[PDB]
C-alpha cells in the first residue's frame, strides 16, 4: 500500500531518550520509515524552545493533503542546518524514535510510505 494508518505516541520533549535518528539527512529519513514500519516511531509537537533540545537532521512529518477514517495525511521531510529535503504542508510535529516514554495523546495519520 502506497499509505498506511498508524497511531503516533506523542511525546514530551523532556522525556524523549533518544533524540534523532542519526547523522546525515539520507539516515534520518531511512530510520524514521523503518521506526514507523516497526511501531518504535514517536511524535513530538514544536513549539517554542523544542528543536533546539533534538539532535539534527530533524524528521517532521507535514500535512501532505486536506483526512480519511480520523487520520492527517503526512509525508516525511528532513531538515540540517536551516535546508528542508521534501515540500509538504504543515508541520504536525517531529519525529523521534519511542524507546518506551509514556505519551501525552496518540496522533492518528495516513503516512505516504
Do not use: N, W
Not at 11 to 32: I, K
Not at 85 to 92: F, I, K, M, V
Request: charged letters at 25%; aromatic letters at 4%; glycine letters at 10%.
Amino acid at each position: 500500500k502506497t499509505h498506511v494508518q498508524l497511531s503516533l505516541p506523542v511525546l514530551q520533549v523532556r522525556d524523549v531518550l533518544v533524540r534523532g535518528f542519526g547523522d546525515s539527512v539520507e539516515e534520518v529519513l531511512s530510520e524514521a520509515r523503518q521506526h514507523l514500519k516497526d511501531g518504535t516511531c514517536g511524535l513530538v509537537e514544536v513549539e517554542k524552545g523544542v528543536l533546539p533540545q533534538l539532535e539534527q537532521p530533524y524528521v517532521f512529518i507535514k500535512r501532505s493533503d486536506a483526512a480519511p477514517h480520523g487520520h492527517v495525511m503526512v509525508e516525511l521531510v528532513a531538515e540540517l542546518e536551516g535546508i528542508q529535503y521534501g515540500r509538504s504542508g504543515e508541520t504536525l510535529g517531529v519525529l523521534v524514535p519511542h524507546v518506551g516514554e509514556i505519551p501525552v495523546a496518540y496522533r492518528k495519520v495516513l503516512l505516504r510510505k
